[PDB]
Amino acid sequence: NMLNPKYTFDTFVIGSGNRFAHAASLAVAEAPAKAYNPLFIYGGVGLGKTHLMHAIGHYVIDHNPSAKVVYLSSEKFTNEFINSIRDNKAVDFRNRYRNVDVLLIDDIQFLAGKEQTQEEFFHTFNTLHEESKQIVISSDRPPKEIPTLEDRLRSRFEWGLITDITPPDLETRIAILRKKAKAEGLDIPNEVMLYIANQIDSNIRELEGALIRVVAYSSLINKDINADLAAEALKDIIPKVITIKEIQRVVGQQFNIKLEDFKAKKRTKSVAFPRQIAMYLSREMTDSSLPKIGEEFGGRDHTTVIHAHEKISKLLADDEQLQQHVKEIKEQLK
Amino acid sequence: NMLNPKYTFDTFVIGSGNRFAHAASLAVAEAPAKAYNPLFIYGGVGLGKTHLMHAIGHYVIDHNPSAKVVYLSSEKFTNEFINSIRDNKAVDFRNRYRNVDVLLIDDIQFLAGKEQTQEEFFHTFNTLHEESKQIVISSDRPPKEIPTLEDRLRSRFEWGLITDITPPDLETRIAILRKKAKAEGLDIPNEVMLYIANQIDSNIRELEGALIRVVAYSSLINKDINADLAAEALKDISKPKVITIKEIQRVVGQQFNIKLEDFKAKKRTKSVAFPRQIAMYLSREMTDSSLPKIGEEFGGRDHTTVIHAHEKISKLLADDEQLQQHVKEIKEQLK
Amino acid sequence: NMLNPKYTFDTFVIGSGNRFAHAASLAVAEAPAKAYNPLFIYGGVGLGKTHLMHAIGHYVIDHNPSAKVVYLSSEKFTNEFINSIRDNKAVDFRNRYRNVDVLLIDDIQFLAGKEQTQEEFFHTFNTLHEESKQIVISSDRPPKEIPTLEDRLRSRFEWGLITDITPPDLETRIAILRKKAKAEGLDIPNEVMLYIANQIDSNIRELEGALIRVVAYSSLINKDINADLAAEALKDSKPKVITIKEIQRVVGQQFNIKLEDFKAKKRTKSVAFPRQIAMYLSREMTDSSLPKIGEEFGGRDHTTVIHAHEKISKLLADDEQLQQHVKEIKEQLK
DNA sequence: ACTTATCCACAAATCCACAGGCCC
DNA sequence: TAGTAGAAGTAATAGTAGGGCCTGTGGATTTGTGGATAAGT
């Protein structure tokens, strides 16, 4: 059907960032339409939302062959809705999508900006919840911050349980890697898994891609996977914390001035202008507080910091090659 | 069909710079949607990405006549998408591009700056991957550095297997010359191909152009192909070593027996300044960096000092054949 | 149509400096899209490139009346492309220029700098090449020295065969003056033949212009053509085009500075004063654009030329010597 | 003690993306 | 057996990439010019 055999509760590795979502989803799977009817789950990219939805559908269909579970995306929903109302066959669209025992609608944020598709989904939600049919909704952002969503639809989103998924930590990253390797059926040393999980922490997808690249490169070189071969396979794939000290050093380097005279009390232009540019960069790049940066600037007052920042912003608002130099400095810092 | 009969896995030549991509493409063509469902090949220009895409298409079509293999470039995708939007046949566009066993989309970087087409390709990718359909994506730079690409699409690109093509080796350039000569069915002595391969190193396209020009000039003059005729034909036709300041000061320090760190020292002695003055001269002569940067590389020395040293060295070499010879030797060493 | 019938494969003669291009073009005409599919003819002005392109078009259309052969200059291509974008007829533009059997594009050099049209020409090239169509391109310089040409388009240009056109020699001039004499059906003495052959060598357009002048003089004088009449006709009535190269070479002759260093980034006063003088003179007596002057002089900005002209005007508004020298050089170049 | 080579402040020729007005 | 004259109809999408440049101030910026300064002789 429309579900994924690889996406099930057994393949899901439970961790700190997905324990709550997993438990809520498992409750919904065990007691459809009776425990948490409007379930809403949101998170980042490559975190397990569609995996969890397919696991819910798999569990319900496995335990209840007389269950009409339908998984779909928001894009497919709008496509089918508009096609139906263009073909003048809307009655069949309604008949299909109001009689589902479980509705697993995905990436609901796509509905933002489509007023009539939002209205049709609103009526679909009302009809499905009025008859005790399970509703699971997935998003990338909490329902509050989905734009162009009406109060009615948002309030239906918020009626039941709302969960969240957080990026995974090291232990569960290594656990996911071990599970994927064991499912594939190859023995990989634990040092390789630790190496990969350390040097790629973005989501499942780049982690899986790194594992696939390691395996493919090792198979090509017909050598057993080790830490050095994994390093060579991931040489071409592999952010830094910005530091006020590093910013000052860089700016002083470009603008022909030493390091010890940043805290000097000299008011010469040739030193003040690079210092003002460096402090403007620190203000508009780092989250460091104004008292802290002033302390790093030899105890300069917040009023003086304000005046220098405003002067630099206004002066840059009239020219472009200072912006070019700032862009070059930022590229160097990256 | 839309595929090239010239591009095939047979006509492709395995080199050290493309063995990985050839193996990945061959495995994908042997087992579509079952080995590496999203496959992402990136590299330089004229390096053999469309060759591999057409080769995969040919293999899949030949080994499965009933499979729908569709090859297109990014600009064709955008043109057809926008045309469908204007003509209200977007349903036809979706039904055409969401129901293919194998999709082969070329030069995906062109989508940078096309937000609606990026969304449409995102959804097409999602549908094809859900339905266990093979997707092959081509580009010149990895998805990390394609600008204005949504993180969802980037994460999809990074999901499967990403492989790269690197510029060809001398041996494989000679092999490509041999293969092309055999394909067009005339014989060329080995030294001519060796000369062409040594002289031309950018990508396959310039190599093919050089071979075509040599063959055509030989046919025109009605004389047999040799090294002198090849040179005459190619009269007007493995890396550009970009200079760097650390290299130039390393060369001058090895020439005049001064350590690296002392280059940033404040000493004003003659035996220190004169190498530094000629370093200023050669830096301004060769590199495109500003005199602010030339003062950066010596720990913040003034552009005025740099230019004063420059004109001093110019005046010196105006009457110093020994200095001219030394600077020429420095140029030869750095080149 | 758009093809000049004066140029045809019959009236072109195998010269010493153009036999290679003639043979390549003839092979292309005999076997379109099969022999040398991307054809690239680079050479000086008035040497036979347009003649060869028109001959190729004539041959292909004659031996295949159903073939779609289109010839155009790059100016027309750019203008049509821009107007298609402006009027939202870009679909019609693409339909016109991607479904032709043979395309003959003229003067590809000045596309240098005009971006977004060398991407549409890139896509047109790729469409024609993949659909097994024929492309002929004309230029005044080898592709490796066409400025601001993206590496992909450069590789596309160099993928094919490159033909060098050399200025004609004595025998070629003699042959084509015989050709024009047979074309226009008048008889001239061998003395005038040799005269016009050997004492006139800039380009064959100049040769034809001298022919026209001699014919007009003979018709006006109502006397038989002879060496004395030819010499009297060619003693000197033409407004010379004030070119940037002429201006800069006059400036260099007057100031003792070479020409190649004008491309150098060096901007000492002794060479910057002649540079800004040349910029002001070009702005004064050239209809050419300041960005074109900058590109011919190192790819500099138009605002640079504007500032140089403003500074020169300010200087001449105060110093009489500068005005006198400017008047002297203007009279010299006039 | 002075003058000479060297480093730094300062002003001007130059070059950048950027506002605008055609006008197609 | 040879058979008549039939009306009043809805609520509806999501939607693209794009042209140089003729001009033209504003302002950085990257230097040369001049001045300030240590030293060494």
Ligand SMILES: Nc1ncnc2c1ncn2[C@@H]1O[C@H](COP(=O)(O)OP(=O)(O)OP(=O)(O)O)[C@@H](O)[C@H]1O
């Ligand atoms: N905890 C986990 N354990 C195992 N696999 C996981 C886990 N979290 C995510 N994954 C992997 O995520 C992959 C795909 O991610 P998924 O589609 O579930 O997330 P998503 O990007 O949030 O979803 P969506 O498609 O709704 O945008 C699956 O193949 C699955 O193996």
Ligand SMILES: Nc1ncnc2c1ncn2[C@@H]1O[C@H](COP(=O)(O)OP(=O)(O)OP(=O)(O)O)[C@@H](O)[C@H]1O
């Ligand atoms: N081993 C090889 N690798 C690459 N190209 C080869 C090889 N052997 C022959 N060629 C020829 O050299 C040309 C270079 O490949 P290709 O044209 O695909 O470069 P590309 O820049 O990747 O193409 P595109 O720009 O369309 O992506 C091909 O047209 C091909 O016919």
Ligand SMILES: Nc1ncnc2c1ncn2[C@@H]1O[C@H](COP(=O)(O)OP(=O)(O)OP(=O)(O)O)[C@@H](O)[C@H]1O
């Ligand atoms: N080598 C030549 N021999 C004889 N005639 C020539 C030669 N070159 C140019 N001509 C004459 O010039 C005319 C047009 O060709 P020409 O070389 O002027 O094209 P062109 O200058 O390249 O034009 P464009 O710059 O528009 O491409 C022809 O009618 C031809 O008589």
Ligand SMILES: [Mg+2]
């Ligand atoms: Mg989702």
Ligand SMILES: [Mg+2]
């Ligand atoms: Mg490609």
Ligand SMILES: [Mg+2]
């Ligand atoms: Mg021309």
